[PDB]
Design a protein around this nucleic acid. Structure first.
Ligand SMILES: [Zn+2]
Ligand SMILES: [Zn+2]
Ligand SMILES: [Zn+2]
Lengths: 123, 107, 74, 74, 56, 71, 192, 93, 119, 186
RNA sequence: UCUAGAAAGGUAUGUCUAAAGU
RNA sequence: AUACUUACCUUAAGAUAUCAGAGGAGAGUCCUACUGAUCAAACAUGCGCUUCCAAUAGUAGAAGGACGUUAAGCAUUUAUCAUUGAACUAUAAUUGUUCAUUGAAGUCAUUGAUGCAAACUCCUUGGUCACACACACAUACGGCGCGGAAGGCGUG
């Protein structure tokens, strides 16, 4: 996958990030929020790790296969003190053109909502 | 002078904040690094990860992060009685300052 | 009523009662003496402090840095 | 009743000794000045790792977060 | 200040004694229960079918 | 800034785990804006040995605050 | 403040003879009435005499073992007595406002017309018209149904349950003014 | 100050079962009574897993906010209103 | 002076960021955040073997370097090669600058010069 | 998870079931008791004897610090121009062209119009008393009208009425300018 | 010595008063 | 809907791209539907630019999973200490060994855990497009069909 060169973390919302952390763990989940302290909110994250036993297989000297422990965690929020790096993995479910259409439609619905709320409270 | 040292830092104004920073560099503990930046003497820095470096200081900051030049890192490593001494030469370098322990100034 | 922690440290100061200060766990020394003053950062100054390991040395009048205290007990 | 900031203002131009928290490497010398965050420059300094004076250092600067205790010396 | 996103009503300076008293307000509880009933109803009721890939 | 909401845990017995390994029990009396706490009659739960008549824990090294009493 | 070490500095600096006008002796005895009503809607402003914790715990030590200074008691009793008598005037004003509602003019002429309408089976007709007039007085009550909280002076009601009353009685106003009434009862028993 | 979407989301989950792992390794999981602004949480009727696995039980706990590594809120708060990108607040007071 | 405003001026320059763990990151630098959150485009993550026979590498950083996912597997040394890493600020120990840059134009602080001139 | 502390009706808290509990998988790093950066950080006096000479013999003179000397150039400019402005500013009894009669009778009027005349300035100032002398000031380097003038009245009570009247009323409306007036100030 | 006019709202709460038939 | 009662509370400061010049307002500031250059965003619009887009002339195939089965798979390895009694090798807080009392606390699991390898089944995803059933290529290969997804670079 290829990510645009000028794309900060504010622009990668609904991508599927792969957040590394201070312990070797990795939280593969869909991003949907962040903060000044960089403490993300991952949607469907899967906290992986490489065990203490199979870590000898990564030690420098066919391929190498590592058996990791996928542990499903639904809608975590992270604490930003722990994060070490973020790597993008997968693109969103929607396109860019489809997100443009859906964003114009949401803003149109919000403006109709506030119009009806104002004209109802004036009546 | 006394008026900016005695008060808390949230009661100062912006001109007094900048005046306090200039006072803290020119008459203070970081005046060692400032005198070594002007007077071109080599400094010896002992980082927190048991790497000692030796360099000249092009610029410094309130956090002690500093831009060096002609860096000569020197560290030692061992596993038991086997022990070697290592050296790495880096030309230009930015040192994030939270790892420093003791900046020294060579006589 | 509530006794705030700075009030308890100032109580330890004002009756001059002998305290024992536990440091960080992997340092391995405790310090025993009388607290003479403190700041808002819990860094304290002790008079006739004696550090002990886990019979120990005398230290005089030290400024114990408050980033390192775990627990101050009497 | 002496706070830490007047204590450290009182130790200027006196032989003090700080103790780094790592290897018990204490440095002792004449304290030139202090900062608001208790950064401290020394002068005519000596080091002791475990009572083993590795040398005499000219002018050192000891970062704020490292120092465990600062103590006055006879 | 504070703004109850579910309630659609602002509030003055966000003090925990004002905010916590709003969050157990009976009218806020009705608005929140309506919101989450409707969102669960929308995700049940939404038949999104797979796109059709017709081969010859 | 914001005081911790320990108005329920006042004047009761409390078991807190200092610094990971250690664990201290005592009768809580006061707290501050940082979570430094002062607790009467502290006994280090290990054959356990008692600390002193009053302590004051720096709140850098509290991890959790279990309340032994009814609360 | 914004950083927590700033607020901690504020507290320790206000922690670090003992007579004269500089120190509010009323706080020194305890519960300054300009301190107990700082934020509320009965706010007096700011306490003029400064408040300080070093002096207060020195007074705690002094009345623990040393001595008691009765000039502090008579000053506190003066300030306490003037506030309590002022709020006794204000609760008198509140029940005066209930009276002034109760002796309203058009309501008095309406109850006068219904009480002229109140004028054996004569007693049964008079009792039916008087129960209608009792329900007219109770309709005037159903417009209001106000009693007066005897401590604070604010209004209350009896149709309301015990729990919304328990919501009232743990107030800032009512706890502060209960504390004032209790120190006034203590000092008026002790001086007499 | 301002809190942003994660701490505000944590405030949206007061009352429901959350599951949080501290930085020491432990895992506590109960009904979240009161969170705070600094992610300082309480938890009622919790099931406390020690780091080497020994699960016990304890009535309430108050973790420091600084020790939390993650907090696992329920699934339906995906549809929370604060995740809505185009919002139209009516008028300030 | 705040020296991160020096690092903001280095754009599209190859650097070699040493992390606190020991792993070094080598790629095209990009927009640096004010808390020194570096974004690197075409990185070549690596982890140096200690070059003593008996000694160990970092275990935590080794498992982390695998769990970036893009470790090129059949190679001998711990080298992972990926695109777009986003390094958090407080984990960078030192940054090896490129050699060709002119410090004597980069280190001129515009805001300090403005504050000295306008006052 | 059978009976709830939540305010919402049991209907609404069927929606907020959590996931099943998290499986236990053993930790892979250092426990909280043993977490430390490296101690046994060795001393620094070893470096100063041997390795310092092997540094200085390789790099004997340091690079020029040119950004520092650009700051030095602007600081020399500020100090030098302050000295010259102080010298020319310090060096009125030796100004001749302001050395008329007693000073309380001389009113100062400034921001006067650039193309004005001494006769219409005289007509304006004479309304509040007899004038003894006038002297519009011009730039001595080239005689651009400086917009200020000196007006000597016959008496100081007459001078202070011109200041009162034509100065406090927003500026004396002369030609197309508002010229405020005060005392001589010298 | 250089002219002091303190808010006016928000949310939470109960009670009254009231509007409906087939 | 209206009204009254009571509770709780009443706001960190400044800014909205930079450099440079010209002009003006009593050395610095401020301004210019002023002027150049630099940076940034949006919208258009382009590149013989790079990567990717699933059989029907067939019952297939790619990427990702399974918190799926065979499966108690095959190979290893674990299951608390004390005080004493009876005997007992023995520096220990009788450790080792069989049986018992008493005592601390004591996640469950041993069909488990850790290592290794295979087979089978089941999910989710897409141009299942158009033309064709063909003799190309050293400068290695007309990249000279309509689109779509993602990135690179340039202009207005
Ligand atoms: Zn609401
Ligand atoms: Zn008072
Ligand atoms: Zn009351």
């Amino acid at each position: 996958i290829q990510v645009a060169h000028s794309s900060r973390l504010a622009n990668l919302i609904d991508y599927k990030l792969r957040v590394l952390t201070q312990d070797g763990r990795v939280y593969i989940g869909q991003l949907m929020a962040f903060d000044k302290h960089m403490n993300l909110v991952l949607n469907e994250c899967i906290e992986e790790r490489v065990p203490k036993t199979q870590l000898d297989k990564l030690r420098p000297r066919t391929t190498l296969n590592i058996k990791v422990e996928k542990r499903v965690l639904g809608l975590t929020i992270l604490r930003g003190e722990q994060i070490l790096s973020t790597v993008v993995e997968d693109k969103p479910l929607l396109s860019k053109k489809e997100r443009l259409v859906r964003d114009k439609k949401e803003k149109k619905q919000a403006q109709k909502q506030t119009k009806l709320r104002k004209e109802k409270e004036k009546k | 002078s006394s008026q900016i040292i005695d008060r808390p830092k949230h009661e100062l104004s912006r001109a007094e904040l900048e005046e306090l920073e200039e006072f803290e560099f020119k008459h203070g503990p970081m005046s060692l690094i400032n005198d070594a930046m002007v007077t071109r003497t080599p400094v010896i820095i002992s980082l927190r990860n048991n790497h000692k470096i030796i360099a000249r200081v092009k610029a410094f900051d309130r956090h002690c992060n500093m831009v060096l030049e002609n860096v000569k890192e020197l560290w030692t490593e061992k596993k038991g009685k086997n022990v070697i001494n290592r050296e790495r030469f880096i030309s230009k370098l930015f040192l994030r300052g939270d790892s420093v322990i003791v900046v020294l100034k060579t006589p | 009523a509530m006794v705030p922690p700075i009030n308890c440290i100032f109580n330890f100061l004002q009756q001059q009662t002998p305290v024992t200060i536990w440091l960080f766990e992997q340092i391995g020394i405790r310090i025993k003496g009388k607290i003479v003053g403190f700041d808002e950062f819990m860094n304290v100054v002790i008079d006739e402090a004696v550090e002990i390991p886990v019979k120990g040395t005398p230290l005089g009048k030290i400024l114990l840095k408050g980033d390192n205290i775990t627990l101050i007990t009497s | 009743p002496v706070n830490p900031k007047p204590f450290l203002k009182g130790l200027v131009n006196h032989r003090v000794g700080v103790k780094l928290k790592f290897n018990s490497t204490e440095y002792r010398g004449t304290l030139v000045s202090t900062d608001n965050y208790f950064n401290l420059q020394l002068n005519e300094a000596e080091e002791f790792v475990a009572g083993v004076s590795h040398g005499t250092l000219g002018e050192i600067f000891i970062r704020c977060n490292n120092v465990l205790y600062i103590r006055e010396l006879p | 200040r504070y703004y109850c996103e579910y309630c659609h009503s602002y509030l003055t300076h966000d003090t925990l004694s004002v905010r916590k008293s709003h969050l157990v307000g009976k009218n806020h509880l009705r608005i929140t229960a309506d919101y989450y009933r409707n969102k669960a109803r929308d995700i049940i009721n939404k038949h999104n079918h797979k796109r059709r890939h017709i081969g010859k | 800034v914001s005081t911790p909401e320990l108005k329920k845990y006042m004047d009761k017995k409390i078991l807190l785990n200092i610094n990971g390994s250690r664990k201290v029990a005592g009768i809580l009396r006061g707290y501050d804006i940082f979570l430094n706490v002062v607790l009467d009659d502290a006994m280090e739960i290990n054959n356990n040995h008692q600390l002193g008549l009053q302590t004051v824990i720096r709140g850098n090294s509290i991890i959790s605050l279990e309340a032994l009493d009814a609360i | 403040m914004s950083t927590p070490a700033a607020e901690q500095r504020k507290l320790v600096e206000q922690l670090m003879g003992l007579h004269d006008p500089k120190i509010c002796k009323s706080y020194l005895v305890g519960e300054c009435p300009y301190d107990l009503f700082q934020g509320t809607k009965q706010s007096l402003g700011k306490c003029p005499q400064m408040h300080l914790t070093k002096h207060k715990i020195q007074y705690e030590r002094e009345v623990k073992q040393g001595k008691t200074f009765p000039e502090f008691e008579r000053e506190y009793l003066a300030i306490l007595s003037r506030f309590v008598n002022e709020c006794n005037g204000q609760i008198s004003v509140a029940l005066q406002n209930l009276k002034h509602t109760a002796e309203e003019r058009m309501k008095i002429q309406q109850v006068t017309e219904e009480l002229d309408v109140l004028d054996l089976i004569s007693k049964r007709k008079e009792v039916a018209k008087r129960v209608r007039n009792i329900t007219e007085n109770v309709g005037q009550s159903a417009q209001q149904k106000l009693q007066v909280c005897e401590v604070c002076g604010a209004y209350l009601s009896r149709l309301d349950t015990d729990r919304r009353l328990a919501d009232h009685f743990l107030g800032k106003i009512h706890l502060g003014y209960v504390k004032m009434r209790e120190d006034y009862d203590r000092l008026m028993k002790n001086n007499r | 100050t301002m809190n942003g979407i994660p701490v505000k989301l944590l405030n949206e989950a007061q009352g429901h079962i959350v599951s949080l792992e501290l930085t020491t390794g432990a895992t506590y999981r109960g009904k979240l009574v009161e969170s705070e602004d600094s992610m300082n949480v309480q938890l009622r009727d919790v099931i406390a897993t020690e780091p080497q696995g020994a699960v016990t039980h304890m009535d309430q706990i108050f973790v420091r906010g600084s020790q939390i590594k993650f907090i696992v809120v329920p699934d339906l708060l995906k549809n929370a209103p604060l995740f809505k990108k185009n919002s139209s607040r009516p008028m300030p007071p | 002076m705040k020296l991160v405003n020096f690092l903001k001026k280095l754009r599209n320059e190859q650097v070699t960021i040493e992390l606190k763990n020991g792993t070094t990151v080598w790629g095209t630098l990009q927009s640096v955040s004010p808390q020194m959150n570096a974004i690197l485009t075409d990185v070549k993550l690596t982890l140096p073997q200690p070059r003593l026979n008996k000694l160990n590498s970092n275990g935590i950083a080794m498992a982390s370097l695998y769990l970036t996912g893009g470790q090129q597997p059949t190679a001998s040394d711990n080298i992972a090669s990926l695109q777009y890493i986003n390094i958090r600020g407080n984990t960078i120990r030192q940054i090896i600058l490129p050699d060709s840059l002119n410090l004597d134009s980069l280190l001129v602080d515009q805001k300090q010069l403005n504050s000295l001139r306008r006052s | 998870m059978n009976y709830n502390l939540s305010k919402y009706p049991d209907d609404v808290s069927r929606l907020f079931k959590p996931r099943p509990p998290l499986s236990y998988k053993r930790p892979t790093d250092y426990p909280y008791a043993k977490r430390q950066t490296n101690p046994n950080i060795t001393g620094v006096a070893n470096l100063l004897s041997t390795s310092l000479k092997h540094y200085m013999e390789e790099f004997p003179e340091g690079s020029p610090n040119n950004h520092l000397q650009r700051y030095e150039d602007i600081k020399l400019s500020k100090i030098k121009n302050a000295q010259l402005l102080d010298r020319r500013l310090q060096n009125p009894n030796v100004d001749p062209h302001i050395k008329d009669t007693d000073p309380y009778r001389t009113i100062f009027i400034g921001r006067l119009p650039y193309d004005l005349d001494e006769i219409e300035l005289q007509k304006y100032f004479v309304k509040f008393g007899e004038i003894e002398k006038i002297r519009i000031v011009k730039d001595k380097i080239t005689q651009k009208s400086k917009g200020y003038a000196f007006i000597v009245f016959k008496d100081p009570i007459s001078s202070k009425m011109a200041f009162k009247e034509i100065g406090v009323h927003r500026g004396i409306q002369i030609k197309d300018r508002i010229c405020i007036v005060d005392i001589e100030r010298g």
